[PDB]
């Protein structure tokens, strides 16, 4: 069982299953995949859609007529399979010209070029029916302190995003932007390193309602942060526009393992959250099948992303519906957490002697939270051990 269907909204970047396995120390282990073949193979596995960078679809430097051809063939594949394109993004990191950034390159002519390369792809994304346009600032940052005045760079980043906003507004496009944060790699430190930094920056843009976040499991974990806590803050702010799902083993290089790999418990708490909150965006996998694998291992890895999400969804649902868990949640006062501290208001609080002057602090101190009992029930549900 645990058979995905298009209704689950599982999507994959072309660059994921298409990763040839070139890493910093080694050559490609797999041949290039034709975009058309990935769309067919992914449709068969039960995915809902694909996502793309401009350069994954249209070889860099293609003439207009080659461009048209490449798009026509891809569109035929989407029509043949029923696959959608809910998101797209720009490659502002591969070509040498972007070595010091796109939107925040020190060189003004490069920043202009980055904006133009981006706008041309927004038009194509809208034509293909994308609802979300992602920006990953992978080259925006520094290896040394004097190379990048961060205040000026944030001025340039605000400027670029406000211009993009102006463009989509003037063209009457129904697309929104999502920033994908990452703390480092390939630059020593990348600007807007976490979901929090991205959420704070968005509030200073001219039209903040057009921008949200595309957080990635492995990225927040590269800073040692709790990914479900970070997603909860994004949901609370109304800014979870998209999500990247994958696996990461702690603080090191960006692994991009299949979803469910890495920190398994954090994966369970994430699915519990997404499903309880009613998140209805795409479930996108930004992952790389390891370079050990041949083409059969590529499709197995991708199928496993989807499988692990669906097993985790069933176990989270079972945990929340268990009457014994419901009672534990009450024993730990989760119900009280949800009630206002002082709906009576500030003067009532100040006059309330049971809040301070006659508050028995030692009796309140003695009450156990019963969190460990709750957590082991959650453990037993994850592992299928409530038999």
């Amino acid at each position: 069982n645990y058979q995905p269907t298009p209704e689950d909204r599982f999507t994959f970047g072309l660059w994921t299953v298409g990763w040839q396995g070139r890493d910093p120390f080694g050559d490609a282990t797999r041949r290039a995949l034709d975009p058309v073949e990935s769309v067919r193979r992914l449709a068969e596995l039960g995915a809902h859609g694909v996502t793309f960078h401009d350069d994954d679809l249209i070889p860099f430097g293609s003439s207009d007529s080659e461009r048209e051809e490449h798009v026509k063939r891809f569109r035929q594949a989407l029509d043949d399979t029923g696959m959608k394109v809910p998101m797209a993004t720009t490659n502002l990191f591969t070509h040498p010209v972007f070595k010091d950034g796109g939107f925040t390159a020190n060189d003004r002519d490069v920043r202009r070029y980055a904006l133009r390369k981006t706008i041309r792809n927004i038009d194509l994304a809208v034509e293909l029916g994308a609802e979300t346009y992602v920006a990953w600032g992978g080259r925006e940052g520094a290896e040394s302190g004097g190379a990048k005045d961060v205040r000026d760079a944030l001025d340039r980043m605000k400027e670029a995003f406000d211009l993009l906003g102006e463009y989509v507004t003037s063209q009457g496009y129904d697309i929104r932007f999502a920033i994908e944060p990452k703390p480092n790699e390939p630059r020593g430190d990348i600007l807007l390193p976490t979901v929090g930094h991205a959420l704070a920056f968005i509030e200073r843009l001219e039209r903040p309602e057009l921008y949200g976040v595309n957080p990635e499991v492995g990225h927040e974990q590269m800073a040692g942060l709790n990914f479900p806590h970070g997603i909860a803050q994004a949901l609370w702010a109304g800014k979870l526009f998209h999500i990247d799902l994958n696996g990461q083993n702690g603080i090191k290089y960006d692994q991009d393992l299949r979803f469910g790999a890495g920190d398994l418990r954090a994966a369970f708490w994430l699915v519990d959250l997404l499903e309880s909150a009613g998140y209805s965006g795409p479930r996108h996998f930004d992952f790389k099948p390891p370079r050990t694998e041949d083409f059969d291992g590529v499709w197995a890895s991708a199928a496993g992303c989807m499988r692990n999400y669906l097993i985790l969804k069933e176990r989270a649902a079972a945990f929340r519906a268990d009457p014994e868990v419901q009672e534990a949640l009450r024993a730990s006062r989760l119900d009280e957490l949800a009630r206002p501290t002082a709906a009576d208001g500030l003067q009532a609080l100040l006059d309330d002697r049971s809040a301070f002057e006659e508050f028995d602090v030692d009796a309140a101190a003695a009450r156990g939270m019963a969190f460990e009992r709750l957590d082991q029930l959650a453990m037993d549900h994850l592992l299928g051990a409530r038999g």
Copy 2:
């Protein structure tokens, strides 16, 4: 030389020099310090002022008349020395009642009590002339996923801060709030873990203009983040209300080493930033003299905080005034980073063929950034090796 004076605005918490050296594995190595003796000793060393938690100054559970006495003696010490009190904070972490939090405890009665304990200390802080009231949510978080619904907790945290805002506004107090972020310890994961998360949360409060950040060097480093980059984002947002200075060796327990210890280069880039931006708040040291030390080592450690700031300030000033550095900054196009990408506007950009259609991408790609030359000049200035 490098002799601090009160004009440098160096401040210290009472709990810093007063730390008795109790750690998770060992007993106190030093006897308690009387608050009056710390104010005298710090004045002699050249500090500008002190900061305090309610409980550092007034033993928990003191009667009103003991409270009055304790305050009177401390005030006499401030008058005798000329020492100021620019910041104060509440202890919402030591007493067992706060084991699941203050403002976000699951138990509503504890959340009420935390608000009342906080307000009573705001009144005292204003009486002593504090301009900034810090909140460190050290118990707000979780060790397990099911213990804390983060959305509800952020509702409770917003509620507490909005109430505090209402209180100071209604009393006509000229005080502002600053949140001190920390990613973990003593809870497994703490809410609002970084400067970015804190900045994003503040934008959802009812009166955001009353709240900013009190970032700490060692805390951001506990997440592997670049502290000067984080301070630059806070300065850009207009939210650097206060700062905690100290040292930390990478990702591990919160060390609170003396300033200049830990990551020395990040300390240089921070001072360069604070001084170039014109930061005029207090230079506060939230540090712990190591428990190896006796009282003579306590005062040496504190004096060193101040010394290292002043050596770093001289070296940063020398770096920025060096004509050879000025020319390197131009060679690396720092001047261009500061100029608008597209002050000509969006239609001009789109019509500009030198931005895309006739942009020579290979020639732009070939230009070296000259960052390594710049960085080694910065190295030579730090080390005093431009002789």
Copy 3:
């Protein structure tokens, strides 16, 4: 089900269930437990035995006659319950005198005292029937570079351990030593920081056969290392004398969560390893019930340590016995990994043209490892999803 019995060899330190919840920022949340009550409560839950520091059992500074009394009462409890004492250790970290170390304190008189405090407890451990005597050098290290010449310190550490060896040999005691590594906390950096450093140091002792390791899950993880890989190296060397089981969420302060918490997958791979290798030592839990909990949560947390080990053992056994997994292991060439590279010997290898001159490198390159298929089978077994 998953009911522990004494035959499973689950042991707990007295200091684990006895932890009063004092952390660096807060007071105790639970009252002290009498050692006799912990032995009774642990026996009821199904544990095999307990472990102790000298100071957990005999209050520091007790007279000889109080000492005798304390031991007599504890022995009565062991007799009443059938509980064993397979391991013991010395507290060389709590008292202020050990602030710069025990065996590697700069002060020679303290190093002498540490050796004497240790020997007195070895005698008691043997009397109680301990087979393993653990040393955790928690104060051996430094916060600054000039404080500790590491070569000299390693001379002092070798000296202490060689003396201990001489003592047990001269008394004809059948006890061996195990070093518990930890990379940091409470010192900034601790000497012999990982299992590897400890294994290398043991080879330079005069009688290396008397010493091995007591690795802890959470400690190796505080350095970002793979704990099952580390245990495999220890097993390969014949030095896994004991093990500490618990949970840790990545690189931060030492959490000491219940076993199975933290990195769940690493917990599965560890149990798979221990059980396949035939490890027959104690399964000891060095954990701290979180300070949120009352006494009911303390016993629930301890029971969960044991439960999670037994669920993990069942899932690992099922994975290894599955014929489909056996065939996957062959598809990935695990069988070939176990066969000698060159049992034919060096001259045969050099003359073998199929090894170099006629080796088809491109055909070897093309073969997929099929690791992702294998790993998802392992995922399905862990989660109980091979239905």
Copy 4:
């Protein structure tokens, strides 16, 4: 000043200055360098020598006669400049055939091929006068638990190294082996992850006297470990055969920054150690000029490696020769650390009542270590602030 000469023994890999700037997300930013041009350019800057992988010097798949040609041209360059070749190594990581390892690949035919490729390069290294042959097991490890039985792999790694030993012994070559540890990247976890793990493994080889370590600054730091402490353990064991010098900012991807970048204080403590211990091997830089840089930045970056070592050497010498520092070292009892704990022997210790029964523990406890005073003197020396 701070002008390197060949007598300082600064060496560089061909792959360092030759790095074309291809990273996991981007194409090359610099053209290939001819090995002959790097030898000339490095000689001019004051280096002593170069190091090479087989594949840096002889393009993979070259015929015997092309091989001979490539070697002849390189030898002419070494003769023309006076440059030496003190170390060499094998590329067992780039070609796709090594995707699951060399010596520990699951496939036996690949393990044979790795041994043959290695031996052919040992012959060439000896011909060029290398004294040290380095092995970096960058592909030896795993991304998932079931892919690699670590016990069997350590059997295969021991087997490979014992064969290499047998080869050099039978050929009467005066070369020794050094293992370069790294904890992860490009595999999720790499076998023998730290200096400690490598030192422990060497003690189980048949001729351990032929093998030592080549620790790298940035690698140990990728595990959060103190590099000078690790080098001290290697020196204590007599196994520091070579060293890789570079810079790294904490726990993340392997940066390979120029030496002196990254953790500056750890760089000072390392130079202090190397120079005080009389380390007389090569000072090798395993670094990558950042891909931001053109060829002028490549040579500036390399020159800076050498400059920072020489500034650090002068400051460390000044610290150790300062009579005020000498007295501080005594105040902190560094002299006592170097004296035997119990040269009187075990029975004398046990009979000595001043070691236990009459030891005044509270008076010993009260003595301050004076470490913070010492550390600030070390700070003032580093920064050139003892004027």
